[PDB]
Design a protein around this ligand. Structure first.
Ligand SMILES: COC(=O)N1C[C@@H]2C[C@@H]3O[C@]2(Cc2[nH]cnc23)C1
Length: 130
């Protein structure tokens, strides 16, 4: 219905606003673009599904997310990719892991304060009807 297409348009406006607020935070610059395959050639042999905040906006505009749950699966993949590629005790690996955990925790905290639980349940019920 038109009403259902209006629901998904509100979901996309909400997701673009959360993603912009993450992308302007200086702590998260290392997640604003794909890991460069010329600078890091072993990256795409270790990490089987690369993800970053530029790719997330492209996916919102392609209508890939029909719930906040499917958006948070991609924020969780950015975080898990950084923990698995950079696992060592040295400071550069510890700094990127701390930033990855802060990106995940920040996204979940904005959604807990600003997403209405009944708006998410409406998106889930339209998705399950298709
Ligand atoms: C999310 O970003 C990462 O997982 N990274 C892996 C790399 C390791 C380290 O930071 C890079 C880029 C780079 N070039 C030279 N060393 C590095 C970004």
């Amino acid at each position: 219905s038109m009403q259902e297409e209006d629901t998904f348009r509100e979901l996309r406006i909400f997701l673009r606003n959360v993603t912009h607020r993450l992308a302007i935070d200086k702590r998260f610059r290392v997640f604003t673009k794909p890991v460069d395959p010329d600078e890091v050639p072993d990256y795409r042999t270790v990490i089987k599904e690369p993800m970053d905040l530029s790719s997330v906006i492209s996916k919102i505009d392609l209508h890939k997310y029909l719930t906040v749950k499917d958006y948070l699966r991609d924020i969780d993949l950015i975080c898990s990719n950084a923990l698995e590629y950079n696992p060592d005790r040295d400071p550069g690996d510890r700094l990127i892991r701390h930033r990855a955990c802060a990106l995940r925790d920040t996204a979940y905290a904005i959604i807990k304060e600003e997403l209405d639980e009944d708006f998410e349940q409406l998106c889930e019920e339209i998705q399950e009807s298709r």
